[model samples]
Target: CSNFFANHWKGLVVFLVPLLCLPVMLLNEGAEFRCMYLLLVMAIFWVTEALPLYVTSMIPIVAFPIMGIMSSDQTCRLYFKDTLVMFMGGIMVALAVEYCNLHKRLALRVIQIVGCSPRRLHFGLIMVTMFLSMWISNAACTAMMCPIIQAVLEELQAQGVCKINHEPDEPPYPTKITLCYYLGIAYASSLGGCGTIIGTATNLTFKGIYEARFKNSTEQMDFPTFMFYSVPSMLVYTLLTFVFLQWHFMGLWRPKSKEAQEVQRGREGADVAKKVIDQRYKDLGPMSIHEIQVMILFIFMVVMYFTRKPGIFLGWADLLNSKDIRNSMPTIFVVVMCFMLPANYAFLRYCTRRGGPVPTGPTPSLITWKFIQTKVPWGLVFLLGGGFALAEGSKQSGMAKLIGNALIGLKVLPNSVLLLVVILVAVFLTAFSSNVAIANIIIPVLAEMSLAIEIHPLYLILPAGLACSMAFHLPVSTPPNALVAGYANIRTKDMAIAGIGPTIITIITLFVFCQTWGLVVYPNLNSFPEWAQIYAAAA
Candidate 1:
């Protein structure tokens, strides 16, 4: 009995805990207790994976209505929010980029341009990974780049420039450049996701949770505002990563090799190590039409995101009177075009018949439902819905307020101190759990805490949201980290040694940016914004 219980503990808890909560809920008069119980159950299932996170997400729909905390209709409505749609649309664009091999071409092109000296190669890979992740999923970016790095490694071994260790038990003691190359990809993918709202699940979760919790409030965290506030931290982290890797792994203080010194008199072997990369780039041939089309659309989407009613100046959103159209027009236009546009110019030309009736052949699209079903991160969409539902339930049931009231003793602390504590807690939790889960759990509490303590909610929520993506210390910390570890044979000790410096740098960078650039973007953190005030008064 003891052995069986130990083996199936999580499953047993999932099965038994809710039933156990029933009697406990019966003891309380308020719906907040019931709602809080449901959230706790879901959180356990989510973190333990006793059920799929998406499956766990469906609990709010069933439990909230049955528990009488929220109407079934309202709960279901929370499952398909605008933020979820926005996330879906952004993912479709990434799929198109992937399908056309645009991401690969761009990664290789950047690597080619950055040169291939051991130091340059490491820097190039990091730069490319960071840039791609700013627009696409970090895991996808890492996956796409890993193969390229693998091919580079194989070629170097073939050329006698680097050695490969075949023993699984024996760690490789090769050049530090290889270690930096792999670690850079993992670290950059994580840090880069903070650059834009659509870049990662954690960012989207923050947006969804904030909007759901503050639906009646005017205070907003729009794309441009998010990007403006977050980019400084990301850039600072990226530079710090570069400096740290160069110092620790690239041996900045070490003297140049005798061969490197001799060849620098303008000889060939000075960059002989780089020729392998040049050949790899040459192997890609010229750019394809599909790559060009996807690139254009990707750039178009980014430009629209940056310039759409960005709050600091006049934008296209100002010209539009309808709020729905202004907010959704870019995603709608781009996603629809992707479905309609042909992947091949030949298909487009063949389908067109100017002089006669339209051709009776099948029309090919740059994106397909089949491809999307196979590639899109649908689990993340459900996770977003789940997060939104939790936020809504917490607010509707007064759990958010109750939790805030409970934590009111912390109000005596400085807002700056609280912000750091929140960031620290979020960062530390993320190192051990899912980033989205951490965001879902923390943002609502902070949202209510901000209202209770008379500080703008963004002052607390934004830093926490950004901090969740800063878990670089463990392979299990994030998917990108795990991907790199699996592919590159990075040991836990190696990663821990390399990761500590960047993680600390990221926390400090986020803290400083929140106080400086964040103030500029949101302004006047000490006083509650009037928009939130209007909603509060109405409520």
Candidate 2:
């Protein structure tokens, strides 16, 4: 009993502290206070992971109705929304990519194109990781790419250009190459997620929160608008990080070829690295039918996603006015086809051969229901749903407004300065907490604050959403970071040292773009737009 108590006391404290304060909050602040109380408990539980995140997410469903915040029906509805559907559908497609090893083929093809030079190989890996993560989960992308990265590292070590074993205090030469590769996968997995809506839960959380906060407005942060506004930030940060990593770790900008080459263990290592990559490519043999079919479908989906609402231009979705057909229908349509498509054509051919005995066993689809059940991160779905419910409770119970009024001091700061401050706070907070939790808690408060300050809600909320995904400084910052650390020889100091520069670069990029390019892409960045006015009145 003592041992169990010692292990669980922190969780017990986290659970009870909120309860202890409940009567005080209720007496002083009313039902909104109760809703805020639940938010506080959920936040603590989420950060400490005192309970499973998905389990903590379920608190609002039961607590809200009892607190007279939101009814059970309304809270339940928030659990699955159009954004969740889009996410679920997108994951099915990503599964199809993984199912047929399409991602690996794409990675090898890019590696082949970039060649085997140390610098080019590093760039290629980062590029492949970033591009793949733009469409799939960042952690999934990292998990898939780590082994290939390890394989290359093993090959180089065998050739004596890489070091698999090194002291902690050793010089950052051969080891720096390994460090760069591992951090590239980790960093790019995060940065790339900012480029697309479905790329990370933070982005999707923004979509759901934005829609819920402004349901009556015509302004929607749909697929194209998000890409146009955010991808440039991602691109700029990626380029800067590439240069910074090369400068600090690889000594690429150093004057002497001798010292510079020493970073990746000289030219011999590069040649060996090229050969190892080539061998891996040869091992994949030729592209199979499944790969080709998935490639075509994936390309088609990207085109459809970007062109869905091609502003002021002729686009496919414009042909149909039905919201479902225009927004949700295309992804759902592709997801269905993924399950119906054959996993292997040779099996079909063999089964169809003349006079062949009837095949009795189960045949595989391109993706199977069982595969999805096992592979999909259902916890994320529940977590997102919980965020939606929490946001709704805040709004429905007037907790958001109360919190907004409390933050009225933010109005005195210059908008540009305030934007930078919000982004920085989110970046720093995410280094310690779940980015999804940060986004859920912060965006709603910012949304309410925007109205309190007479600025458009998106001006504050969008940047916060992007900033939350910038948790680069700590392994505990994001799942992708933890995934890389598990497979590589990275120490905490290595990630922190490499990550600090990129984190600053991302914050600056977000601030600059939000003022200039972001305003161009998303016009509501400056003044309060009319759509927001509609939303405010209804609220």
Highest TM-score scorer? 2
**Structural similarity to truth (TM-score) of each candidate:** 0.62, 0.65
lDDT of 2 by residue, 363-397 (tens): 66777789878867666567656655666666678
Q: Which ranges of candidate 2 are over 4 A from the true structure? A: 1-9, 19-27, 116-122, 125-236, 242-268, 343-364, 411-503, 508-539
Worst 10 residues of 1 by lDDT: 258-267
How well does candidate 2 score on lDDT at residue 225?
A: 80
* lDDT winner: 2
How close to the true structure is residue 499 of candidate 2, measured as C-alpha lDDT? 78
Residue 292, model 1: lDDT of: 80
- Among residues 3 or more apart in sequence or in different chains, the pairs in candidate 1 whose N, CA or C atoms overlap within 3 Å are none
Cα lDDT listed for each candidate: 0.69, 0.71
